[PDB]
Design a protein around this ligand. Structure first.
Ligand code: ANP
Ligand code: ANP
Ligand code: ANP
Ligand code: ANP
Ligand code: MG
Ligand code: MG
Ligand code: MG
Ligand code: MG
Lengths: 372, 372, 372, 372
């Protein structure tokens, strides 16, 4: 045996690599694009579909779409097309030799995990597989046993409280506000400056505006007063046609949707009150250890100043004698993959794989009574 | 006080009148024309500019242009010239005595509404004003509280879901396909018959072809089979030079762009799928009442057979146990003005005006925290 | 100031008079004759040159020639000799007191208009001048703003479409078939009867045959069948030597050259197809108003039956639902002067003159950026 | 099979040859002339019609006319006469053995392409044919996939944006200002020097003046100031009668009609603003690649200094951080034929022909659902 594969399929990026590494060798977006215009040059390399980094380059003529929406895979033809691109075109492996570690969000459909298991054996014919929960793997990456994990990615934000090795599945919150809903609110409030980004190729531009110019205001009602003297507030951004946009208070205002989800019409609470309501559903003897370990992960927790507001605004909810310590590693974008590289290389793990023999005598329903 | 003014400025027509009436006294196109040829007769009444019904008559020698494109006013010199023509030359009022109700599209620039407010006080010096959203006013005209409003005009098509008095601003779709983009597609597909309408004075002829000979096919793939036996399909039209054109399948084919916007190269969805995606972004307890109230308005919803296809094609998307009732009044062209005549004559409204005193101590930014 | 002068210099006649009158006081041909024989009576009043009505009387012993051929003045010594005869010998004015309105054909050389301007200031020293286009002035005489003008004179036939005060300079046709080319075709087809008019004094007789016995056939292929029974077709004419000529089908056949210019070997089209091709180069919204206003002017449009054939033969080209109205005033010979009398007496015109001060600081090139 | 024919039928020239060559073997003008004079020598080789290079030599006695005006073939008798001259008299082939590649302009009538297809099978009986779009073939000649193509010929100027193999048919502009409208403006402004070119045989002289003495001014308002000191500006040209003309500012002033079409009374924009408005109708992610690839083609883009003004005047419209690279090959006159020689010799193309069997069971309407 050489090694094992760790394929972190997310709603926005597909992180992939080998176990035992410290960074994924394969980071490309989870986009499958079909061309939508006519097509008039004969031959000269026109494929029926473009996946990932190729569709990101040719995106002006493509109808881009995501096969994964809010964690749930909705377009199993396109998801088998990304996995085919991930293993062959991007990692250059043989899938019949390496065991594959997959990740998915908690509180997810049963058929979403059975259908991953059916594809990895009946189509790729892997020797073994295992589906892990992402917020469990975010805590191997920090090398811990205790802590609540705020894993906010591109499709789903979810808290999982984990005390000393033991997960508390009744306190797992799942909030479907994520980075893809911050882009779609940003396309709505860039309209009030005048700039109209509508089609799906501009959705990948407003995503790139958000990753470069948006931050989290430490007090939202005071930065809106700073928009009176919009001097250091406004920044510029060069679009791929050469135009510039002067984005102003829309920098700090779209990540406030993480803290006030009523901006996009959701009745639910922000990520500071879904952390606090998930600690307050735990036992009273472990709430001191969950305050002191607030592990953030995922790429939506990469804004400048989001650890400073989570530490500010849980403290206004928690009793004043408990210390709050939001713990943000700088590598926290890939930490679901970093913990998957650790868990697949542990020596105590090689009896937890779902082998091909164990699958065949049990069908696709083996994955529920074996993984979690 | 005599009464209030209701000035519905659209991208294609300027509807204007007084509150409490049942029809606008002033319907003229929103066109400002400059002459482009030499000019050789001395004197005898040559103005520098021609606005509205006058420029529509003298259009053979004029460079006609619209100051409003896609809802956004782009040419504030010409828009102050239409308003000057609307009040003085067309309504024959004094603007310093009547409060003016203005309309504009939702999801619009902030500077578009501030600059209307700055003109109506610093130039016309009105006693009071109020900017209303057009799809709110389309629902007073039907005398209701509940319904999604498909307001398709000449610059912008937009859905606004309104439950029992409460607007849902996160489900407001805005699609910039409208009647001016159906004319420009019709000038492109009349070329394949041979007829070349190019200059801006022929743009007002193809607009008049579209308002007389175009309808909506109930099944587009079967009317294209009827173009084999083009017997009852083809109609004729007498041009203003005496020529006739025999338009064939181009009758039903340009309003299909409302239902398949890929004909003009837009990635977005048709008006039957922007209604359905705007209901599916509402709460699940109000989707039954939004199906049963589909208020159409605007002049682009005046084609023969557009209520019959909207009722056909939402039903193919909606679940089969929900009833769909597309509600098209016959007066639906002016229904943004009809609801503006109702709202300005309500007794509960006279504290919602932005008076001249309230403007002066607040600047032009009063209109955002007072209207909507 | 007394009044202004209107000097309509044509290729065949010099119409001159004062502004505000209804008929020119000075109508004499534009002929400068030199004697060609010996000269044997000593003294008794022999001048070196004879101009106009005097050379028309003494024409048997003179080499008559026209200084203006096809609108272009080619013999500037003789044209200064006609203007000297026009002002002093014929109007009896002082040129240093009256401003002079001049006319010329459209699409004319630049040096033709500069050299008129140089003569009227450096030789006659007029206070002011203005060069107008003849087909503009033909439309003041009918008191209008809209119409295409068929101005066919003795040197040039030209259409100028004029919509409501605005000339369309890209649709101005200029056809150099005129009355002097109908005389020269008539001298060629009177030869086939036997009568040989060759020298220049007989050119002024065939011009007088044409003004008295020639008409326009309403259908040319049927009047040629009437030449079989030449009973009412043939007329007689008494020459100035007492001889008679019996002109037959040559009455209607030389004005057919206006409608079929291939008789004199021109490739171009007739005056019914240069009117139609000049309307079809206009905008499609003004073609209805140019059909209903077909102003004829000039002396070549004075044949019996030319309005009846223009109305017949444009109708065969125009679409059948457009009305055609050829508009021939009875005074249409002088209508370039009649409109020049109107334009020079308008009150809105006295700032359009090129004064002597404006000329001196600008040279002769002022006339292009001031008149047209 | 020997090879295939590439017949580039243009409005001004008929380029023809074989596939796989680097230059057409048959370049002759698209002129069919009928004699117009009497004809008095008995026998000695007088045909009823003269086509192409023969009618160009004998043009003094012929009524020359073009069967193709603005891309649309209007005179199908004469166009079958050119094709008969092209294959038999000029290429000396048998049309029943070679498959024929035809070109035509985009946004063209449907009946123009059906009637080419009906002639090439029912009259010439070719084995196969294919109608291609000219601006697609202009991009094979530069050997590319990406670029907007400014193909300005003798009848039609049209932009076609082509990204990586995929044409964008909603951004295709078509402007009917071309070289034949620059000749007709040049015949109008040579009149103001005095020189009157009127009949159709002089239309082929002013075309030859334009191809030798006209250039494009880099700044039009400064070359008009250079016309004050007309020293290096004026050139001479020897006419075929031996006369000389001293053309002055009319050298640079007629190609300015390409950049200001209001000189000939067109309301539309120049070729620098129909390129920019066609890029601004594309997607925002491909506008960087269309700026860097501005392929000019056709013979109207052969003026000295037209690449230097297109690079100057798009840059004044484009944002200042985007590079503009107008790409003019020196062989750009024949580049529609050069790309047609490439496309007909590709190995991936031989299933795109419309064979004679495929035509017979489908009628003439096969060409729309098979070519484009
Ligand atoms: N620097 C950044 N600042 C802010 N947001 C960012 C940044 N980088 C990425 N994002 C957002 O994070 C999203 C992807 O983050 P990531 O956590 O990798 O997604 P994901 O984990 O693959 N989706 P999932 O695991 O299913 O929840 C992007 O779509 C952006 O919206
Ligand atoms: N009978 C008709 N059938 C089809 N289309 C029509 C008809 N009458 C008008 N139209 C089109 O619809 C438009 C009617 O104008 P209107 O509905 O008022 O647009 P508008 O409201 O002025 N623009 P806006 O309010 O900003 O959306 C015209 O410009 C035409 O393009
Ligand atoms: N009754 C008539 N019938 C037909 N032709 C006539 C008649 N009277 C004059 N003509 C012709 O008209 C010519 C003069 O007409 P006229 O229009 O006055 O010339 P003109 O206007 O001075 N030249 P121009 O300025 O170029 O129009 C004569 O030379 C004749 O050829
Ligand atoms: N050297 C030149 N300089 C400027 N213009 C030229 C030159 N040579 C040719 N032309 C012009 O280009 C025209 C022909 O160009 P060309 O592109 O070959 O015609 P064409 O492409 O066959 N017509 P079409 O294909 O229907 O657009 C001539 O009629 C001239 O007006
Ligand atoms: Mg993740
Ligand atoms: Mg409206
Ligand atoms: Mg005259
Ligand atoms: Mg060409």
């Amino acid at each position: 045996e050489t090694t094992a594969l760790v394929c972190d399929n997310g709603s926005g990026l597909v992180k992939a690599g080998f176990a035992g590494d410290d960074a994924p060798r394969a980071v490309f977006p989870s986009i499958v694009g079909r061309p939508r215009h006519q097509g008039v040059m004969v031959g000269m390399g026109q494929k029926d579909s473009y996946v990932g980094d190729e569709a990101q380059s040719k995106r002006g003529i493509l109808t881009l779409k995501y096969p994964i929406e809010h964690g749930i895979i909705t377009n199993w033809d396109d998801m088998e097309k990304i996995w085919h691109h991930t293993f062959y075109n991007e990692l250059r492996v043989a899938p019949e030799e390496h065991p594959t570690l997959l990740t998915e969000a908690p509180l997810n459909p049963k058929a979403n995990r059975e259908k991953m298991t059916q594809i990895m054996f009946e189509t790729f014919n892997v020797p073994a597989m295992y589906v892990a929960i992402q917020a469990v793997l975010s805590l191997y990456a920090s090398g811990r046993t205790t802590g609540i994990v705020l894993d906010s990615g591109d499709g789903v934000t979810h808290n999982v409280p984990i005390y000393e090795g033991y997960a508390l599945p009744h306190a797992i919150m799942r909030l479907d506000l994520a980075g893809r809903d911050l882009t779609d609110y940003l396309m709505k409030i860039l309209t009030e400056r005048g700039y109209s980004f509508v089609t799906t190729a501009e959705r990948e531009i407003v995503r790139d505006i958000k990753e470069k110019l948006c931050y989290v205001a430490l007090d939202f009602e005071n930065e809106m007063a700073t928009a009176a003297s919009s001097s250091s507030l406004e920044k510029s951004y060069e679009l791929p046609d050469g135009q510039v946009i002067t984005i102003g208070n829309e920098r700090f205002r779209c990540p406030e949707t993480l803290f006030q989800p009523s901006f996009i019409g959701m009745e639910s609470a922000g990520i500071h009150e879904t952390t606090y309501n998930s600690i307050m559903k735990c036992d009273i003897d472990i709430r001191k250890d969950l305050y002191a370990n607030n592990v953030m992960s995922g790429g939506t927790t990469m804004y400048p100043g989001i650890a400073d507001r989570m530490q500010k605004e849980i403290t206004a909810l928690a009793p004043s004698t408990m210390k709050i310590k939001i713990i943000a590693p700088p590598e926290r974008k890939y930490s679901v993959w970093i913990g998957g590289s650790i868990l697949a290389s542990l020596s105590t793990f090689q009896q937890m794989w779902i082998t091909k023999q164990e699958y065949d005598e049990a069908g696709p329903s083996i994955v529920h009574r074996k993984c979690f």
